[model samples]
Target: QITFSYISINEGLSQSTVFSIDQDKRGNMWFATYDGVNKYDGYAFTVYQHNEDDPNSIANDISRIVKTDSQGRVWIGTRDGLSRYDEEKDIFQNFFYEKNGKHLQVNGIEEISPEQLLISTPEGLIMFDIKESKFIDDSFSTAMHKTIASTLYRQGDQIYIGTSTDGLYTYSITQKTFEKVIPGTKQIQAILQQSPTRIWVATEGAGLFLINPKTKEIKNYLHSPSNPKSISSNYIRSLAMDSQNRLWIGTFNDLNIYHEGTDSFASYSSNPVENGSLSQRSVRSIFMDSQGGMWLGTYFGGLNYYHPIRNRFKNIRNIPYKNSLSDNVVSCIVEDKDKNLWIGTNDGGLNLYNPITQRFTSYTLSNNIKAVYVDEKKSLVYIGTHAGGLSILHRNSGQVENFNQRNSQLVNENVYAILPDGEGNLWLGTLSALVRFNPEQRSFTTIEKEKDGTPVVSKQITTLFRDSHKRLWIGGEEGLSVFKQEGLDIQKASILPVSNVTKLFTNCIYEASNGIIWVGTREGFYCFNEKDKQIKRYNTTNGLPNNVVYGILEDSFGRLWLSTNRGISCFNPETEKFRNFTESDGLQSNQFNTASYCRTSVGQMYFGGINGITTFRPELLLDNPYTPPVVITKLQLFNKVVRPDDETGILTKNISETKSITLKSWQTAFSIEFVVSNYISGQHNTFAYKLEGYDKEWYYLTDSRTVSYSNLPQGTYQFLVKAANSDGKWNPIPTALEIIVLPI
Candidate 1:
């Protein structure tokens, strides 16, 4: 399934009607709306519009076209003429041009040469010089100088000019002439030349026309009532070809994908109410970024960004609907034998979720749930709570039996955890002590101390788990214990010393397939090898997002996924590497709850947090192995931004496009900003940079993009930077920039 994230007036967009979108050389996303121009830097949306009192503003508010030139200038075209954004001076320069009662109503701008551009407009194809920003008097062709153009696409020397009603015209750059290729087309919106013989033309009412420019053969496709896979509408608007060479068609109603094998179109519908669904149908513009992130500019839905990497997990939260989770403060997760999910929340009691129907059923229990352990064979669910000591529910009969210190011998007021020892007995972790409960006898035994009279673990018991060796692992507020049983001999349990760990507030305990025991405690988690007697500590210093490890759950692949105060951390024991995920990666909440982790029989891992539950399959590994485009987005000198328009003349173009830069001897301080265009889960994008002439080794960074150097000696240095995507697939090639310090 595909997931889409929306950005509209609700999400801080300038206008609902986004006509076009373009990424400038400096990594800023620019949007052309009817109201104004918007510049987005994955943060705030800055709007630019016409202001009568301010000459530095855009030319007109009726902006339709926006583009970034070869250098660093962003061109905004409206009815009043052109507006150029000069970054170095932080201002917009306006220029008004007209020809014989015809305005410079720019439709498309294409590169004609290295120093020239062919600006397509209703009046004709005009030539604009790059260096002087001047329109040449000589036209490309005498016939096309007065023709109206809706779209222009260039491939090598061939130019495809699409008109509103006159069909598409093919022009030769070498011959400087144009010829009509297709005829009888209405409202030509977009033209795509797939190959030398195949040209796709999208029209408003004429449907899609596949034109063969070489043989004059044409194939017309329209909506049919008989086929379900038929095109949704004949009124097409825009067209795009993805990196996988799949043809995507945008229509007035919805989005469509052209099927090559069946020769039909599959429409993807839009639902305004559903999250992760397309918000709008009238796709005005489609822009795919460097990381294959499809950015859609719609007629009313502002912007919708679609990337498969962001859609891999399912979130269970309070949706206000009756069928959703009862509350967001999810505490525990467990899967029953019937494949049903039981969820425990902070103050919302317990809920039974049916995955197939996606409906919720609240269980009969107390409101403040703390821990839950399901006994499938007995058809009973043991639920523990803060105020209520324990509640045993007969799932088959829907009868809930409550127990408390006031009513029974259940002395512990706050039951923290419950784990079965595969016998008739159950071990319960409490606020102040560990208790053993026998359901048949309906009795509770509190074991507060060992044979030597030392306290059992600590003053307060927190967590419990049974390892593969049949040794009961018990943890408390301050220490951990590994116990062996010959009739509940926990009094002689061996303690794992907490002298080396900063804080040992245990949250979870588990042994992996390799027989390595993992203990989630405060400050960091610990891994103890029983055979080697080696205990290794992992914390924020070892790539953990937070020092507080709440819980740990292992996937089928033997990879341990830990929940922490910061986010979810997936550590590969084989690689000894860590990859962290947070709210930026679609997590319900970064701060997860203790004893709120579980893995289903089918290998589905679930971790509950303060907000909700996050569930994902370990088998469906979402790894972005694609190479990221690393580019230097900004260059600064003396703490001020440096651009091509800078008066220093140290650079003639955008720093990203410029290979090398020279600075005076006195200009000893500078900084460069680079970004990896990994649109999905950008929080995990890793960076590595090296200064060839100054650094001893490559400096690696996570979530940091800017590097500064000051007080440098007069010499030449090469600054190279590379990046890896969210999956840690590093790009072998780096973006290099040469820095030269001129002698005094």
Candidate 2:
């Protein structure tokens, strides 16, 4: 199931009613509301409202429409008139339409050409000349007089108009006359053209209509009582097309999606029982931003954001019901041979999940569950807890057996990890010692100091694993140890002989398909070669996200997924590169729990965090395919704007067109603001930038849109920046700009 996150007054929004939404070329989102115009750059909103003392401010506080022009400027329509944004000056230029000495309200705006714009008003269609900065006298189409134009669309030589109560009409540019397309009795709300041949018309209460311009054919899609998959309501309010070519219909009662391939409509209504469902039923407008994120402007509930990549995560969290998870703090996850998910929580005990039924069965226990292991052949599940020692559950009979320090030879009640041996014995890691439990005897034997009198392994055990080579791997607060068996009796285990292996605190242990032992530690991650007796360590300097590694998982694709204090890193063994993901990638939390990662039989992986668990199919976690175009949005010299000879001081409008800039040596304190062309989940995007002649390594900035340089020595330098989308797939190449600072 897909979920939506909301942005409203609590997140710095000006008002709850969002009237219009648009995105600039620099990936900044703009929303028009009754209070003001809000400019969002992922982190915060910069609102522009009417300032009675300043003429350059927005003309009115009630901004109803917003659009971006070819010149990369934002134009806002308000109740009083229209205001065009001047990005360079950071001001607005207002234009009021007055005929017969009365100001007309601006409803909509459309670009007819690079030098002209068609503005919709109650009186008629008026053309505004960009060069003259005024409306043309003869360009007014009096044929539309006395009609309230709500929306407008232009295709070929024809202009389509939608009115509040005057119905739909098409005006011919060549003939300079208006002709009614639909009956004048129906109220036209919106107009959208999919292609040259097809146009969509939405009305107030008559439903949606598809019209063919050439054939003049109309197809109506209205709500039906018999067909539950039809449009949700007849009162259509808005229409938008997503990047995947899916048409989103916003109605008075629900949100409907029209898929071209299936020729079907999927409706999403507001359900009070669903926590993350749509906030309101009345959606006023719909918009798809550059990064493929869908934004819905509702009548009362506020702004809703639907990320295209949201479906990747099947989130399981604690809810207030019997069927929901027992607790939110999931510590470990595992899958059985029958494809059932077994989840262990910190305090709520164990849960068995049946994916087919989408239901959870909770087994409440006295202690906080830490680790779990399933014995498919014996139909038993073993659980490790913090205070209750160990517990075994019989799958067929639903009977549970508890083992603690009082009843068994268990050295400690705090069990951290558990693993099963093929020969019917289980290995448990605790805070004090590593215990080997024999199922038949219902007893435990602790592994203590070796024959040399040195402790066999640290008492503070953290993880346990058995590799395909029949070798038992142990990790703890001190280091790693490998156990070998001899003649049905356990042989004395010794620490790995790799350099510095005993001193490093370990968290997880795993053996890859290539037989290399992978150990996660507080210092770094190490790959041990048993035959060669060599160890290779990786840290943040080697592309790891953080030094404190918690859990390690090897996917079917031969990639290792490492959970750390910063984020999750997927390391490709073949390429020796790391791709990182964080909370921005739809994770419940960036800080994951130790020994809490698992892979299913069908290639699905789950990593439990402090808040909840994030589960997804690694093979289906695709990266954003777009190579974002880098653009410089702002440039400041000594904290002030430096206007170039050109009206627009953009050195290179886009990264595709290369250009160079020169600066004076005295102008050492300066800043450059740049943004990627991606807006979908833009809040999580990161950047790596470097100055070739000054910086030795790439400087990483998290969710920051600007880079600055100050107190620089007079020399030539090159600024190269590269960006990674929310998914952690970095652009292979950097956007370069040559900078020359002339000597004083």
Candidate 3:
């Protein structure tokens, strides 16, 4: 058997969104990406967007969009106001709210009744009768408020209207009358009428309400502490009804599916799927397709698909060249008349995906496709290139028209992303700011940093994902950003330190399955507690083998194994006893680089080291072995500190100032274990004495002539000594001493 090691490298992503996805009538896909939109046709992709700028045209900035009755005419809504395209003529018409010859700011446009369109602004909602080509009322429809919240759907004979802080209302196109529905509460975000008599309304903080439009009955489903999955979100921004009659809810944290029959809900958190997959879990839009596949758009998590049958959520991200994806980022998704899947990458331009083949073709700087739109109706595609400006490409004829910076709406060549609104208008993201192109009057509108008060302007825009509820999640270099289709909420993310970190820990730090993280450093052994953010250092000061730690382990019996420069140590934390072994303990050597314990099936412990493996079995030393008889030799004091001096006739010195000491007695002995009894009594009791040859063990020698002293104490002393035999017996005294010392 053999073994090997493997390593991998990763590239980090910066932004993510939810709006870069779209579905067409035939169940195909279309993507309105930040860089552009890609249309998928089974086997290949046709991407559309402008990367450079042309002087003859405006930069590519797509905003809002809507499909019309004509098979070819697709209405585009942009920052530059309203525009309509003639599929056969390849021409676009521009529109604006002119008040006393001055153009007021056009926020958004929506399709109202079959023959009418509603244009919303800060002032009011301008109603455009498509058949009459004029406003029903010169002053536009008034909602009894200054700011228009949004234009909802038409139910039966009444047109539903939402207000910023004024609640909900209804307008009758036939009677030209306005009627209030839900009052008292302010800020009506969305209204969904399941039936002609009942409407589901979403508010900012009032939770979700099921209201009877005629009876005026309201039911609130607020979140509770016992259940975090409830509708506890601070704001209800978007809503959609799936095929199973489940209300798809979008909030600040995640997307919630509320089943009306079961009164139950489910939420999808977040994951690191693509380069940038939604900055956060904040959901914005949701749409249920005919196939029962529910599409969700979020503020940061990009586009997610929920399969009701499988009860699973699928995140569609912009896959890169290989198995990796450029980004899981999306801002919005729309379904065109033909079934084609359009994918928008955060920063990688546009990608066309073929659902049947599961293949993709992308258009970026390297490709000739620009940033704006691919007009399938007229067999022509509009491109908003970088410095080259506006370019028109004929799909069938393969002809191209280039517009330069002098006449185009492109402010700079560095374009980030693009979006198309409901009208025939184009929105552009640039290096300095945003821009809009009005296809109708062949004009432009600039959405610079000065107008939006955004924190980041130079960031490169990559992808855009829009939800059914109409919120836009913009992907950029910094992170995911968001703005409601109504242009109310705008938010960005904080700089993240945990992102893009390829290697946070080396082999030096190992995370164990027991929830303990062990770190081996040059200083010593350190046990880290992530909860307390503290480290416990163990070293030689506390009985460790050595302060310099080399290797560590946790055995099968849950004992810590430590190998140090000194020896191999085993610390049983449960027993609080650390046992160590050195060269004397059957270990081959003391230079043990690593120590480990292994458990066999038969319940035996085996210790291993660099020298070799060893088995530990308890044993004892042999007892009482035969030995030779002990021998005797002359003994002496190595460094005798005492000398005979002026004292009580023995080894003495001055009580306060003395230098040397002399012995007055001497004795010879085979061993110094001999006992002398003559020096045990009261005479000269304070003086010290020793034998000459065996002076190391102090004894009073009986023979005084053989002993010598430099100075003697003035007193008389007696000495007797004995020696021990080889058989451990003491012999009788052979000599005695009578000494006289001079007192000081």
Q: In TM-score terms, which candidate is top? A: 2
- TM-score attained by model 1: 0.75
Residues 1-744, model 1: lDDT tens digits? 556787789767878887777887656678999898888755346688788999988888888777776575687777777677776555688766688875676667766666777677666677777679787747666777766788777778877888876878888888877898754558788888677888888888889988888899899899887886988888888887766677778889888888889898888767654456678878888777656677888887888888767867677777554367888898878887788888988877789988778679887574778788888779889988887898899988999998898888887769888898667878888887778889999889888766566666444777787877677777877767677766655555444544555247777888888888888888688888867677888888888899878878888789999998888999998887998888767788888887788898888889899888888886785777776557776788888888676777777776767789988978889899877655564546788999899888999988578999987777999999998876668889988899888787
- Cα RMSDs, all models: 5.8, 5.2, 45.0
Worst 10 residues of 1 by lDDT: 493-502
Decreasing TM-score order of the candidates: 2, 1, 3
Worst 10 residues of 2 by lDDT: 648-657
Q: lDDT value for candidate 1?
A: 0.79
Better of 1 and 3 by lDDT: 1
Error of 3 at 474 (Å): 61
lDDT of 2 at 659: 59
lDDT of 2 by residue, 146-237 (tens): 55687887777777888876777887766867888744356777788888777888888889998886787788988997997888999998
- Separate clash counts for every candidate: 0, 0, 118
| lDDT-better candidate, 2 vs 3 | 2
Q: Candidate 3: where is the Cα deviation over 4 Å?
A: 1-73, 85-93, 99-108, 131-147, 184-186, 273-280, 309-744
Give lDDT per model, in order.
0.79, 0.79, 0.46
